[PDB]
């Protein structure tokens, strides 16, 4: 609700303006998708 004027590059408390549906369906249509990046987006981060 408020954008601090004295906020730097650490205090933003922002959120997202998308959803958990169109983000997954926009991966197969994106041109040039790496193999080591697409697997990280589908999984729920199980490795280090």
């Amino acid at each position: 609700e408020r954008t601090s004027g004295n906020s730097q590059r650490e205090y933003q408390l922002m959120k997202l303006l998308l959803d958990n549906t169109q983000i997954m369906n926009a991966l197969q249509k994106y041109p040039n998708c790496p193999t080591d990046v697409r697997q990280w987006a589908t999984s729920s981060l199980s490795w280090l």
């Binding site: 040039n32 790496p34 193999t35 080591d36 589908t42 999984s43 729920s44 981060l45 199980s46 490795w47």
Partner: protein, 309 residues
């Protein structure tokens, strides 16, 4: 399989019982010393499951098992200092049953720091929530319950596996003179991998974990009947140390192979787009099977596409 092994749970083992129990005799009236389960399974491995339903007094009495492999209990002026080379096959259990993604990796287990410091290798079961994980494991359950005593397709029976257990303890391998420079350069990699933040982090790897890695490379060539150690055998256990806290595996052995070849050419020719077969020379030398000639022929053009795009 191994006859020198035990089996117990958390509440089934109290403070003693498995180490060295002491009780006054009924028909002699004298403090005797009774051996436990760790003394009968000498030069073997003890099994233990459910590491949650237990107190704290039992873990203290077993701290001298994974670091010193000996029993020193002197209770009541009765000396009973023995030794046993039995490995602990523990099996930790999460607090809430499943691994919580919100909490940290040290908040889901009950093991502290002195317990994990004296312990050697520490693996974590990989959990995958993909549609291909349950689709492949379900096929093995159907073939096992429908085809009774017919799904086993082993190439070596269990009669020859027990025979090869005594040949490993015959010719003790040595250390080659070309491996002292390779161990001093790999410990510094895990030293920086330990300190993810500044100094400390999660798993501590110091001198207790470095001496265990040398034993892994020493025992790696134990089954291959190799005298001197080789650099190709020590790097096998190096990958397990990275994945200890966790068709993609096929793409991993390709990137780690081409990086060790393109760093020694003194000159540079074409070998870019019109000479795509030049990268197949340094890899066909290790190929000596059968299916890696026709089936893997159309796979080389797919891995190289990562750089093209």
């Amino acid at each position: 399989f191994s006859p020198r092994a035990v089996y117990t749970s958390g509440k089934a083992s109290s403070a003693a019982g498995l180490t060295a129990a002491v009780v006054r005799d009924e028909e002699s009236h004298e403090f005797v010393i009774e051996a436990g389960a760790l003394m009968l399974a000498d030069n073997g491995v003890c099994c233990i499951d459910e590491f949650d339903k237990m107190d704290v007094r039992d873990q203290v009495a077993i701290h001298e098992a994974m670091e010193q492999q000996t029993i020193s209990i002197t209770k009541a002026g009765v000396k009973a200092t023995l030794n046993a080379r039995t490995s602990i096959l523990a099996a930790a259990n999460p607090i809430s049953g499943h691994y919580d993604r919100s909490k940290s990796l040290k908040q889901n287990i009950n093991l502290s720091a002195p317990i994990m410091s004296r312990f050697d290798l520490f693996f974590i079961l990989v959990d995958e929530c993909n549609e291909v994980t349950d689709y492949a494991i379900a096929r093995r359950i159907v073939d096992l319950h429908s085809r009774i005593e017919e799904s086993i397709d082993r190439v070596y029976s269990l009669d020859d596996i027990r025979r090869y257990l005594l040949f490993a303890r015959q010719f003790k391998p040595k250390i080659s003179k070309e491996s002292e420079d390779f161990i001093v350069e790999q410990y510094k990699h895990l030293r920086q991998r330990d300190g993810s933040g500044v100094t400390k982090s999660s798993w501590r790897i110091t001198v207790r974990q470095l001496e265990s890695m040398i034993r892994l490379s020493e025992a790696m060539a134990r089954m291959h009947c190799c005298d001197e150690v080789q650099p190709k055998h020590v790097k096998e256990a190096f990958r397990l140390l990275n994945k200890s806290i966790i068709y993609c595996r096929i793409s991993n052995l390709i990137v780690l192979h081409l990086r060790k070849v393109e760093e020694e050419e003194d000159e540079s020719a074409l070998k870019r787009s019109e000479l795509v077969n030049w990268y197949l020379k340094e890899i066909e030398s290790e190929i000596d099977s059968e299916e890696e000639l026709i089936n893997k022929k159309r796979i080389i053009e797919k891995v190289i596409h990562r750089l093209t795009h």
